[PDB]
Design an enzyme around this catalytic site. Structure first.
Site, PDB file in Angstrom:
ATOM      1  N   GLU A   1       0.711  -1.189  -0.132  1.00  0.00           N
ATOM      2  CA  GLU A   1       0.421   0.021  -0.087  1.00  0.00           C
ATOM      3  C   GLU A   1       1.164   1.303  -0.108  1.00  0.00           C
ATOM      4  O   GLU A   1       0.644   2.010  -0.880  1.00  0.00           O
ATOM      5  CB  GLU A   1      -0.673  -0.333   1.346  1.00  0.00           C
ATOM      6  CG  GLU A   1      -2.387  -1.024   1.115  1.00  0.00           C
ATOM      7  CD  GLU A   1      -2.738  -1.213   2.559  1.00  0.00           C
ATOM      8  OE1 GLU A   1      -2.634  -1.629   3.522  1.00  0.00           O
ATOM      9  OE2 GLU A   1      -4.267  -0.673   2.767  1.00  0.00           O
TER      10      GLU A   1
ATOM     11  N   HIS B   1      -2.648   3.416  13.338  1.00  0.00           N
ATOM     12  CA  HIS B   1      -3.183   3.511  12.163  1.00  0.00           C
ATOM     13  C   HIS B   1      -2.949   2.430  11.046  1.00  0.00           C
ATOM     14  O   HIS B   1      -1.766   2.298  11.182  1.00  0.00           O
ATOM     15  CB  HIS B   1      -2.944   4.927  11.341  1.00  0.00           C
ATOM     16  CG  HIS B   1      -2.077   5.386  11.085  1.00  0.00           C
ATOM     17  ND1 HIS B   1      -1.893   4.869   9.491  1.00  0.00           N
ATOM     18  CD2 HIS B   1      -1.298   6.162  11.065  1.00  0.00           C
ATOM     19  CE1 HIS B   1      -0.789   5.634   9.138  1.00  0.00           C
ATOM     20  NE2 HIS B   1       0.204   5.625   9.944  1.00  0.00           N
TER      21      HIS B   1
ATOM     22  N   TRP C   1      -0.051  -7.505   6.942  1.00  0.00           N
ATOM     23  CA  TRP C   1      -1.436  -7.059   6.472  1.00  0.00           C
ATOM     24  C   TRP C   1      -1.907  -6.868   6.201  1.00  0.00           C
ATOM     25  O   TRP C   1      -2.251  -5.435   5.787  1.00  0.00           O
ATOM     26  CB  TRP C   1      -1.708  -6.848   8.156  1.00  0.00           C
ATOM     27  CG  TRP C   1      -3.307  -7.317   8.771  1.00  0.00           C
ATOM     28  CD1 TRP C   1      -4.039  -7.824   7.932  1.00  0.00           C
ATOM     29  CD2 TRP C   1      -3.604  -6.633  10.409  1.00  0.00           C
ATOM     30  NE1 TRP C   1      -6.129  -7.046   8.645  1.00  0.00           N
ATOM     31  CE2 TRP C   1      -5.093  -7.461  10.759  1.00  0.00           C
ATOM     32  CE3 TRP C   1      -3.264  -6.208  11.695  1.00  0.00           C
ATOM     33  CZ2 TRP C   1      -5.881  -7.409  10.664  1.00  0.00           C
ATOM     34  CZ3 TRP C   1      -3.971  -6.275  12.424  1.00  0.00           C
ATOM     35  CH2 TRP C   1      -5.514  -6.366  12.014  1.00  0.00           C
TER      36      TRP C   1
ATOM     37  N   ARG D   1      -7.789  -2.899   9.983  1.00  0.00           N
ATOM     38  CA  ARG D   1      -7.568  -3.257  10.674  1.00  0.00           C
ATOM     39  C   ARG D   1      -7.088  -2.595  12.160  1.00  0.00           C
ATOM     40  O   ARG D   1      -6.623  -2.888  13.497  1.00  0.00           O
ATOM     41  CB  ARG D   1      -6.177  -3.138   9.996  1.00  0.00           C
ATOM     42  CG  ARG D   1      -6.404  -4.100   8.342  1.00  0.00           C
ATOM     43  CD  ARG D   1      -5.467  -3.805   7.255  1.00  0.00           C
ATOM     44  NE  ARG D   1      -5.781  -2.611   7.240  1.00  0.00           N
ATOM     45  CZ  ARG D   1      -4.871  -2.465   6.092  1.00  0.00           C
ATOM     46  NH1 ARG D   1      -3.892  -3.145   5.580  1.00  0.00           N
ATOM     47  NH2 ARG D   1      -5.295  -1.296   5.209  1.00  0.00           N
ATOM     48  N   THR D   2      -7.090  -1.315  11.829  1.00  0.00           N
ATOM     49  CA  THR D   2      -7.202  -0.393  13.286  1.00  0.00           C
ATOM     50  C   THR D   2      -7.951  -0.676  14.677  1.00  0.00           C
ATOM     51  O   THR D   2      -7.963  -0.994  15.675  1.00  0.00           O
ATOM     52  CB  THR D   2      -7.039   0.985  12.928  1.00  0.00           C
ATOM     53  OG1 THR D   2      -5.621   1.420  12.005  1.00  0.00           O
ATOM     54  CG2 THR D   2      -7.311   1.874  13.931  1.00  0.00           C
TER      55      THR D   2
ATOM     56  N   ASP E   1      -5.860  -4.898   3.115  1.00  0.00           N
ATOM     57  CA  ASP E   1      -6.139  -4.190   3.922  1.00  0.00           C
ATOM     58  C   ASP E   1      -7.260  -5.305   3.423  1.00  0.00           C
ATOM     59  O   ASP E   1      -7.601  -6.381   2.670  1.00  0.00           O
ATOM     60  CB  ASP E   1      -6.499  -3.557   2.206  1.00  0.00           C
ATOM     61  CG  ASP E   1      -7.342  -2.173   3.184  1.00  0.00           C
ATOM     62  OD1 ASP E   1      -7.988  -1.756   3.749  1.00  0.00           O
ATOM     63  OD2 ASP E   1      -7.323  -0.932   2.143  1.00  0.00           O
TER      64      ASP E   1
HETATM   65  O1  LIG Z   1     -13.616   3.896   2.098  1.00  0.00           O
HETATM   66  C1  LIG Z   1     -13.185   3.466   3.195  1.00  0.00           C
HETATM   67  C2  LIG Z   1     -11.584   1.943   2.877  1.00  0.00           C
HETATM   68  C3  LIG Z   1     -10.730   2.472   1.505  1.00  0.00           C
HETATM   69  C4  LIG Z   1      -9.578   1.840   2.490  1.00  0.00           C
HETATM   70  C5  LIG Z   1      -9.508   0.476   2.581  1.00  0.00           C
HETATM   71  C6  LIG Z   1     -10.043   0.668   4.090  1.00  0.00           C
HETATM   72  C7  LIG Z   1      -9.486  -0.330   5.148  1.00  0.00           C
HETATM   73  C8  LIG Z   1     -10.146  -1.685   5.541  1.00  0.00           C
HETATM   74  C9  LIG Z   1      -9.378  -2.616   6.390  1.00  0.00           C
HETATM   75  O2  LIG Z   1      -9.236  -3.270   6.483  1.00  0.00           O
HETATM   76  C10 LIG Z   1      -8.400  -1.962   7.048  1.00  0.00           C
HETATM   77  S1  LIG Z   1      -8.795   0.261   6.247  1.00  0.00           S
HETATM   78  O3  LIG Z   1      -8.215   1.050   5.971  1.00  0.00           O
HETATM   79  O4  LIG Z   1      -9.142   0.524   7.775  1.00  0.00           O
HETATM   80  C11 LIG Z   1     -11.521   1.145   3.919  1.00  0.00           C
END
Ligand SMILES: O=Cc1cccc([C@@H]2CC(=O)CS2(=O)=O)c1
Length: 282
Positions: free
Chosen positions: A104, A216, A168, A223-224, A170
């Site tokens: 990422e 974060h 980990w 994940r947070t 997404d």
């Molecule tokens: O649009 C909401 C969004 C966009 C990119 C990533 C995420 C993630 C979902 C996860 O498992 C961790 S996060 O980055 O909160 C949520």
């Protein structure tokens, strides 16, 4: 069974209603609003509860789940880096846990600056990054650690321990076992740093806005939230705090997406079950 499919469906029903109700309206008084044309929210629909906001120009929230105090935030935008570092320094941050993957961060389309693995200068703040140890957490999941030394003319210099889990993915949940290992590492890292401040007579130790772990990932809701829930369960002060409470508190204090995926909720449920912790409020 208090952990059977009926209990789980009731839990989901309550939490889904809450998520839907907390969805941000345009100019929602519950959510922090971008103050000019500079972008505040990384993701337009993943907003920052106003009453628990840390700084007016960050998507970051004070979270208290039972007794456990943390800061959850989005991956800072490039324009936010100086304010993000000020938040880290002012909080005397005892651990920064970054759960965004290396892939990422490397993907420039995602605009996730590599702010903790390289040294840098951000306005009047200079940051020195140094790699420390690496710790395997199970299932091939790796924690890379760093220290960030945050300097600014006229401010006390502050060094922040970093735990970066760089693999980990997404929208997934690492296992309950990996989660518990990660929670322990993050808490232990925080405790060692907090102890150092305490050993030097530090005043931050009396202030509850301070010495909070900062967690974060990319959006700071998936994940947070899984990690923060796990940390809350590692805290002996939270006996009888239900999974319903834990998730509702994260949602009302940040936004309704906290614990984004069913598999992330399932890890919390499995951790609760292992403790004899209730899923639902009676
Ligand atoms: O649009 C909401 C969004 C966009 C990119 C990533 C995420 C993630 C979902 C996860 O498992 C961790 S996060 O980055 O909160 C949520």
């Amino acid at each position: 069974s208090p952990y059977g499919p009926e209990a789980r469906a009731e839990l989901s029903s309550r939490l889904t209603t809450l998520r839907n109700t907390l969805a941000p309206a345009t100019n929602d008084p519950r959510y922090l609003q971008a103050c000019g044309g500079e972008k505040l929210n990384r993701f337009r629909d993943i907003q920052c509860r106003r009453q628990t906001a840390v700084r007016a120009d960050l998507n970051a929230n004070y979270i208290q789940v039972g007794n456990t105090r943390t800061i959850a935030c989005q991956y800072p935008l490039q324009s936010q880096l100086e304010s993000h570092f000020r938040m880290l320094a002012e909080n005397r941050t005892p651990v920064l846990a970054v759960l965004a993957s290396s892939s990422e961060i490397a993907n420039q389309r995602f605009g996730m600056p590599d702010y903790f693995r390289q040294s840098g200068t951000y306005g009047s703040i200079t940051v020195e990054s140094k790699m420390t140890q690496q710790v395997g957490l199970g299932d091939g999941i790796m924690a890379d650690m760093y220290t960030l030394t945050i300097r600014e003319a006229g401010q006390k210099t502050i060094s922040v321990p970093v735990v970066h889990v760089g693999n980990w993915p997404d929208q997934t949940a690492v296992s309950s076992e990996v989660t518990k290992a990660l929670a322990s590492l993050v808490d232990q890292t925080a405790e060692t740093k907090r102890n150092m401040y305490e050993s030097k007579g530090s005043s931050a130790v009396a202030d509850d806005s301070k010495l909070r772990p900062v967690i974060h990932c990319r959006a700071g809701v998936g994940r947070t939230a899984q990690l923060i829930g796990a940390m809350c369960m590692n805290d002996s002060r939270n006996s009888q705090l239900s999974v319903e409470d834990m998730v509702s508190q994260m949602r009302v204090q940040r936004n309704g997406i906290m614990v984004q995926k069913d598999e992330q909720l399932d890890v919390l449920i499995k951790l609760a079950e292992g403790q004899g912790r209730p899923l639902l409020n009676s």
